[PDB]
Amino acid sequence: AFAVDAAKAYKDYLASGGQPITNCVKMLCTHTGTGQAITVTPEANMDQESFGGASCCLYCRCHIDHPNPKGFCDLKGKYVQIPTTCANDPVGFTLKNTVCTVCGMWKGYGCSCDQ
Amino acid sequence: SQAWQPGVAMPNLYKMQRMLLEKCDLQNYGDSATLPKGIMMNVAKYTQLCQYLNTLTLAVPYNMRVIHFGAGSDKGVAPGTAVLRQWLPTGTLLVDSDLNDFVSDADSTLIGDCATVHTANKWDLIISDMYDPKTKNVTKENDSKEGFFTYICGFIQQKLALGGSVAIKITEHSWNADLYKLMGHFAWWTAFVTNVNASSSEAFLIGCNYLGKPREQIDGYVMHANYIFWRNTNPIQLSSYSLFDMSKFPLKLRGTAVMSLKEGQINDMILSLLSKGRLIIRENNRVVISSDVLVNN
Numbered sequence: 001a002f003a004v005d006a007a008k009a010y011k012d013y014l015a016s017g018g019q020p021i022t023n024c025v026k027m028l029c030t031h032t033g034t035g036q037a038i039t040v041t042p043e044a045n046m047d048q049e050s051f052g053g054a055s056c057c058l059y060c061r062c063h064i065d066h067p068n069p070k071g072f073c074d075l076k077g078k079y080v081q082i083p084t085t086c087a088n089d090p091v092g093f094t095l096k097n098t099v100c101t102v103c104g105m106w107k108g109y110g111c112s113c114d115q
Numbered sequence: 116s117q118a119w120q121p122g123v124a125m126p127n128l129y130k131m132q133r134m135l136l137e138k139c140d141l142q143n144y145g146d147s148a149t150l151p152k153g154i155m156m157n158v159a160k161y162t163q164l165c166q167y168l169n170t171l172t173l174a175v176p177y178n179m180r181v182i183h184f185g186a187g188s189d190k191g192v193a194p195g196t197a198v199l200r201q202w203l204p205t206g207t208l209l210v211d212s213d214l215n216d217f218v219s220d221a222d223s224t225l226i227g228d229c230a231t232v233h234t235a236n237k238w239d240l241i242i243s244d245m246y247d248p249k250t251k252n253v254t255k256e257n258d259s260k261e262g263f264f265t266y267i268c269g270f271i272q273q274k275l276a277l278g279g280s281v282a283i284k285i286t287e288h289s290w291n292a293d294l295y296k297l298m299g300h301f302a303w304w305t306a307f308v309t310n311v312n313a314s315s316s317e318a319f320l321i322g323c324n325y326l327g328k329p330r331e332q333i334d335g336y337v338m339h340a341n342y343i344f345w346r347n348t349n350p351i352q353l354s355s356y357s358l359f360d361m362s363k364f365p366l367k368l369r370g371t372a373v374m375s376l377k378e379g380q381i382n383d384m385i386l387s388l389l390s391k392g393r394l395i396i397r398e399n400n401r402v403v404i405s406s407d408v409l410v411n412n
C-alpha cells in the first residue's frame with residue numbers, strides 16, 4: 001500500500017515556510033486572452049500570467065509518476081494560466097486548485113458558474 | 116529604427132566580402148537588455164527568433180514536423196521548446212532533444228548526444244541551440260569546429276525536406292565551415308542576431324527553403340570572417356521592444372502543399388515553388404524517432 005505522496009510533501013514544505021519551486025517557464029503574450037486555466041496556447045488575461053505546462057507540474061519537475069492509472073499529465077504540452085498574485089508559486093497553485101469542467105476557469109479565480 | 120525589430124539580419128553586402136577572420140570585439144559587450152518582469156533570456160531570445168522567422172517565406176504544411184536540438188536548460192526545463200510550441204500551429208509535431216535530462220512540452224523528447232538521434236521521417240524545420248562553452252578559448256586559433264556541427268550538416272542533407280528551413284545557433288567560436296557552405300543550398304540565408312542578446316557574438320544561421328543542391332558556392336571560412344566583420348563594425352542596440360507586441364506572433368498556417376517526388380522529377384518549375392515557400396517535398400507517413408543506446412558494463 002506504500003506510495004510516495006509528493007503533493008502532500010510539497011504542501012507541507014510550503015506550510016513550513018519553504019521556497020516554492022522556481023524556473024517555471026513564463027511566456028510572453030498579449031494578456032488579452034480568455035483567462036481559462038489550461039489551454040493549447042497562452043490565454044492569460046490582464047490578471048494572469050501564462051506558463052509552459054510541463055514546467056508547472058509537480059510530477060514532471062520532481063521526476064516522479066503521475067497519480068493516475070495511465071500516468072497521464074494534464075499540463076505537459078499545454079499552457080497554464082496563473083493569477084498574477086499567485087505566480088510566485090505556479091506548481092503549488094496548480095496542485096491546490098481545480099478547473100471548472102463547464103467553463104474551463106479556475107474555481108474561485110474566474111469561474112462564475114455558481115453565482 | 117532597428118530597436119523596434121526583433122533583431123538584425125546580416126546585410127547582403129557583408130555576405131559578399133572576402134574578409135580575413137579577426138577577433139570579435141563587440142562595443143556593447145557586457146551590456147544587457149531589460150527583460151520584461153520575470154521573463155527569462157531564453158524565452159525572450161526564442162520569441163525574437165520566431166518573430167523574425169515570421170518575416171520569411173517558411174513553408175507551413177498541415178502536419179508540420181519540427182525538431183529542436185539543444186532544448187534542455189541547466190534547470191531541467193525547455194523554455195525554447197515552450198516558445199516554439201506557442202509559435203507553431205496547433206497540431207504541429209514537435210520533437211526536442213538534449214544531452215542532459217529535462218522536462219518538455221514537446222510531443223516527444225530524446226535524451227542523449229545528438230549523434231545518437233535517428234529519425235525515419237524528414238522534417239520541415241530544424242532549430243538548434245546547441246553550444247559547447249569549451250569553444251570560447253580566446254587564447255587559441257579559431258578554426259571550424261566539428262562535434263555536433265558534423266551531425267547537423269549530415270542531418271540537414273539527409274532529413275530536411277525540400278522547401279524546409281533551419282535556424283542553427285553559432286557564435287564567434289562555435290561555428291562550422293560546411294554549415295555555411297550548406298547555406299548556399301537554400302533559396303536564401305542569413306545570420307540573425309536577436310536584439311535581446313545583441314551584446315553576444317551568437318547568431319542564428321537561417322537557411323530558408325532548402326533546395327537540396329548548391330544554388331551558390333560559399334566558402335565557409337570566408338563567410339564566418341564576413342559575419343565577424345559585420346558584428347565588429349555594426350554595434351546593435353540591445354532592445355526588448357518587440358517582446359511587448361505579441362498580437363501577430365503565431366506562425367501563419369499556410370497549408371503548404373506536400374508532395375512526394377523523386378530526384379529526376381525536380382525541375383526548374385519545382386525549384387521555383389520550393390524557393391517561394393510554396394512546396395514541401397517529403398513523404399507524409401508516420402513520424403518515428405529513436406536514440407541509440409550504447410550498452411556497456
Ligand SMILES: Nc1ncnc2c1ncn2[C@@H]1O[C@H](CSCc2ccc(Cl)c(C(=O)O)c2)[C@@H](O)[C@H]1O
Binds near residue numbers: 155186187194
Ligand atoms: N553534442 C551535443 N548533443 C546534444 N546537446 C548538446 C550537445 N552539445 C551541447 N549540447 C546542448 O546545448 C545546450 C546549449 S544551452 C541551451 C539552453 C537551453 C535552455 C536555457 Cl534556459 C538556456 C539558458 O540557460 O539560457 C540554454 C546545452 O543544453 C547542451 O546540453
Ligand SMILES: [Zn+2]
Binds near residue numbers: 059060
Ligand atoms: Zn506532468
Ligand SMILES: [Zn+2]
Binds near residue numbers: 101102104112113114
Ligand atoms: Zn465554471
